[PDB]
C-alpha cells in the first residue's frame, strides 16, 4: 500500500535537518520496502535528487525514533515550481513525556539489563518495544 510511484519525473529536494539528532532518511521503494540513505548530522542539510510521488520518512539514525518532516510522517516530493527545490524540514516531534523517558533509559541501559531495572513488569515490555520502521508502516497501513 505505502510505496513510491514510479513516475520518472525528477524532483530536487533539500533535506534540512532542524533536529538535534543524526537523521536517517528512508525511501519507501516500489515494493514498499524501506531503503536507508546516508545520514545527516544535526543542523546540516543536503540537496538531493528524488522523483515526484516518491515516499520518504525520517528517523534518528541510532535509535530509530520517529521524526517529523514538514509537520508530518511522510514526505512526497511535489512538482518543482520555477526551478526551485522543495524544502523538507526535518524536526523533532513533541514526544510524550513517557516516550521521552523511554528514549533516555534506552540510551543509558543496554538491552540485556532492562530486567535488572527496578520498575514494574509493564515498563519492561515498553522499553523492549523499540521504535521500528516496519512496525510503523503496519500502523500507517
Amino acid at each position: 500500500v505505502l510505496r513510491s510511484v514510479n513516475s520518472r519525473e525528477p524532483s530536487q529536494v533539500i533535506f534540512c535537518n532542524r533536529s538535534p539528532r543524526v537523521v536517517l532518511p528512508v525511501w519507501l521503494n516500489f515494493d514498499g520496502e524501506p531503503q536507508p540513505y546516508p545520514t545527516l548530522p544535526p543542523g546540516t542539510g543536503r540537496r538531493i535528487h528524488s522523483y515526484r510521488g516518491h515516499l520518504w520518512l525520517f528517523r534518528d539514525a541510532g535509535t530509530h525514533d520517529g521524526l517529523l518532516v514538514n509537520q508530518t510522517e511522510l514526505f512526497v516530493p511535489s512538482l518543482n515550481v520555477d526551478g526551485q527545490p522543495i524544502f523538507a524540514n526535518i524536526t523533532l516531534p513533541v514526544y510524550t513525556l513517557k516516550e521521552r523517558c523511554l528514549q533516555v533509559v534506552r540510551s543509558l541501559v543496554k538491552p540485556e539489563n532492562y530486567r535488572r531495572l527496578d520498575i514494574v513488569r509493564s515498563l519492561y515490555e515498553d522499553l523492549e518495544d523499540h521504535p521500528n520502521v516496519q512496525k510503523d508502516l503496519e500502523r500507517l497501513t
Binding site: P93, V94, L97, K98, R100, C101, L108, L117, I119, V120
Partner: protein, 86 residues
C-alpha cells in the same frame, strides 16, 4: 485558572488548569488540589515543566528543542509519566 499539584514530600506546585489537563489521570483526579504520594518534588517539578513545554510547542512551526531529562531522574520520571499518561 490554576490548580495545585502536591508532591509526596509536601511541595505544592501551582500550574494552569489547562496545562494540568494534559494528563488524563489528573483530569479524572480533579473531576482543585491533587496529592501525589509516589511522586517526589524533583519528579513533579519536571512534570510541570513538560506541561509548559507541550502547550508551547504543540502545533508550532518554530523549531522544537529537545525536552531535557537528567539520567538521575529518568526512571522515576518514567514511572510518573506512565501513571499520569502524558
Amino acid at each position: 485558572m490554576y490548580v495545585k499539584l502536591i508532591s509526596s514530600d509536601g511541595h505544592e506546585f501551582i500550574v494552569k488548569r489547562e496545562h494540568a489537563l494534559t494528563s488524563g489521570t489528573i483530569k479524572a483526579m480533579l473531576s482543585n488540589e491533587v496529592n501525589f504520594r509516589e511522586i517526589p518534588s524533583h519528579v513533579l517539578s519536571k512534570v510541570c515543566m513538560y506541561f509548559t513545554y507541550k502547550v508551547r510547542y504543540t502545533n508550532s512551526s518554530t523549531e522544537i528543542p529537545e525536552f531535557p531529562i537528567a539520567p538521575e531522574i529518568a526512571l522515576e520520571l518514567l514511572m510518573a509519566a506512565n501513571f499520569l499518561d502524558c
